[PDB]
C-alpha cells in the first residue's frame, strides 16, 4: 500500500541527505539504562488521574464544610510537570531540575528549540527514545516533554545521579552537539558495491611507484 512504501522511503531519505545539527541532535539519545531510570522516576511522580483528583477535591470540601472560617489548601501532591506550555514555563522560570524530551515529535518544531532553551538556562536535560514511552510513565498516550521540579527526600539521590548521567551525554557535550551534522549514510548495497570496487582495483597502480 502507498502509505507503507512512503513511510519506508521517508526513513531512507532522512539518512541519505545531510542533516543539520539542530535536527541530528535528536538522533543522539540517552542510553537505555539511564532512560529506564528516568522513566521509572517520572512514573513515581506521575500526575494524579481524574479519579484521584476528584476524591482529593471532594475531601477538601469536607474540611471546609466542617469549619468555614478556617482554610484548607487544595494543592495537588508533588508531581512532574507535563504539557508543552507548562514545561516551557518551568524552564524559563528556572524551576525544573531536569527536563526529559522525546525525539519523535512530529512536527519536530514543537520541541526543536527545547534543548537550546535548556542549555541557555543551564538546566539539565535528556532526549529519550519514545514520546509514547514518556506518555506511559505519566499515564497518557504521548508526551512531548516532562519536567521534574522537586522530589521527596528518598528520591533526591536518584535525581542527582540522574542529573549527572544526562549531563554527561547532553549538557557537557554542548560544543559537539552544536556542530555535529548527520546523515550522509550509504545503503548496504551501496556500501558493498564500494567495498568490492576498491578490492578490485587494490593494486592496479602499483607499478607507478618508484619504490
Amino acid at each position: 500500500p502507498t502509505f507503507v512504501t512512503m513511510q519506508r522511503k521517508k526513513r531512507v531519505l532522512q539518512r541519505r541527505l545531510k542533516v543539520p545539527p539542530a535536527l541530528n541532535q535528536f538522533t543522539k539519545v540517552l542510553d537505555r539504562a539511564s532512560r529506564n531510570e528516568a522513566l521509572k522516576l517520572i512514573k513515581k511522580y506521575a500526575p494524579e488521574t481524574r479519579k484521584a483528583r476528584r476524591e482529593r477535591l471532594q475531601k477538601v470540601a469536607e474540611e471546609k464544610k466542617k469549619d468555614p472560617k478556617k482554610t484548607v489548601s487544595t494543592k495537588a501532591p508533588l508531581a512532574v510537570v507535563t504539557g508543552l506550555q507548562e514545561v516551557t514555563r518551568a524552564i524559563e522560570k528556572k524551576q525544573a531540575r531536569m527536563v526529559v524530551i522525546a525525539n519523535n515529535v512530529d512536527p519536530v518544531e514543537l520541541v526543536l528549540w527545547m534543548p537550546n532553551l535548556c542549555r541557555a538556562n543551564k538546566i539539565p536535560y535528556a532526549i529519550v527514545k519514545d514520546m509514547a514511552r514518556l506518555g506511559d510513565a505519566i499515564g497518557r498516550k504521548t508526551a512531548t516533554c516532562v519536567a521534574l521540579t522537586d522530589v521527596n527526600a528518598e528520591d533526591e539521590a536518584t535525581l542527582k545521579n540522574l542529573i549527572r548521567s544526562v549531563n554527561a551525554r547532553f549538557l557537557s557535550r554542548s560544543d559537539v552537539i552544536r556542530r555535529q551534522w548527520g546523515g550522509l549514510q550509504l545503503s548496504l548495497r551501496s556500501r558493498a558495491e564500494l567495498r568490492k570496487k576498491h578490492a578490485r582495483n587494490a593494486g592496479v597502480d602499483a607499478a607507478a611507484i618508484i619504490q
Partner: protein, 203 residues
C-alpha cells in the same frame, strides 16, 4: 510561552534546518493526494491563530494547487476581437492560490464549513495550504459561543463568495480610506453607486 519559540522558528524559513524539514515534507506531499485529511495541523501555532481549536468538530485538510500563471482556455490559443484581448499565456488569475485551495476543499466536502487556511509548504510545481474546516452538526460546535456563528446558513460556502481571509485579500479588503474607496463594500456595489442614474421626484 512556547508559542513564541514556535512562532520565531517559523520566521527562519530559509535556514539550514528549516529547509531540510520542508524538503522532506515537500517530497512526502508530492506523493500524496490533492486533498489529504490530517489528524493534527502541521503548524499548530499557526492554525490556532486562525481559529482552529483541539476540540470535537474541527478538521484540518492539506490541499495541493499547481503553481504558475493562468493560461486562457481558448482553442489552439486563438482569440478574436481587438488585439488588446489577444493574450493567452500572460494573463493572471484575479484570485490568489490560497483562495483557490479553500474553494476546492469546500466544494468537495459540502458537509463542512471552511473557516481559514494557511501556507505550509511550496515546491517548484506545487503549493500546499492547510484548510481548517468545522462540522456544523457537531454538538461541541453547536454549543460553543466562540464558533457558534458558523452554524447559521448565511455562512454556507463562504469561501465560494470570497468571505474568508484569502478571499478578502484579493478583493482589496485589507485596505481602507483612499486606497479602497472604489472597492468598498465591493467593486460592484461602488459601481452601482457611481453609475445608477438618479431621478429625484422634483428635479
Amino acid at each position: 510561552g512556547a508559542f513564541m519559540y514556535l512562532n520565531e522558528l517559523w520566521k527562519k524559513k530559509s535556514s539550514d534546518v528549516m529547509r531540510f524539514i520542508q524538503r522532506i515534507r515537500s517530497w512526502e506531499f508530492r506523493h500524496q493526494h490533492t486533498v489529504v485529511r490530517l489528524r493534527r495541523p502541521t503548524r499548530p501555532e499557526k492554525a490556532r491563530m486562525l481559529g482552529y481549536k483541539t476540540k470535537q468538530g474541527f478538521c484540518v485538510f492539506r490541499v495541493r494547487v499547481r503553481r504558475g500563471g493562468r493560461k486562457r482556455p481558448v482553442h489552439k490559443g486563438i482569440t478574436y476581437g481587438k488585439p488588446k484581448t489577444s493574450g493567452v499565456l500572460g494573463m493572471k488569475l484575479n484570485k490568489n492560490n490560497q483562495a483557490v485551495a479553500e474553494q476546492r476543499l469546500g466544494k468537495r466536502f459540502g458537509n463542512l464549513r471552511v473557516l481559514n487556511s494557511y501556507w505550509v509548504n511550496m515546491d517548484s510545481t506545487f503549493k500546499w495550504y492547510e484548510v481548517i474546516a468545522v462540522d456544523p452538526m457537531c454538538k461541541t460546535i453547536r454549543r460553543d459561543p466562540r464558533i457558534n456563528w458558523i452554524v447559521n446558513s448565511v455562512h454556507k460556502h463562504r469561501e465560494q463568495r470570497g468571505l474568508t481571509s484569502a478571499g478578502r485579500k484579493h478583493r482589496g479588503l485589507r485596505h481602507k480610506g483612499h486606497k479602497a474607496s472604489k472597492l468598498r463594500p465591493s467593486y460592484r456595489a461602488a459601481w452601482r453607486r457611481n453609475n445608477r442614474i438618479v431621478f429625484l421626484r422634483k428635479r
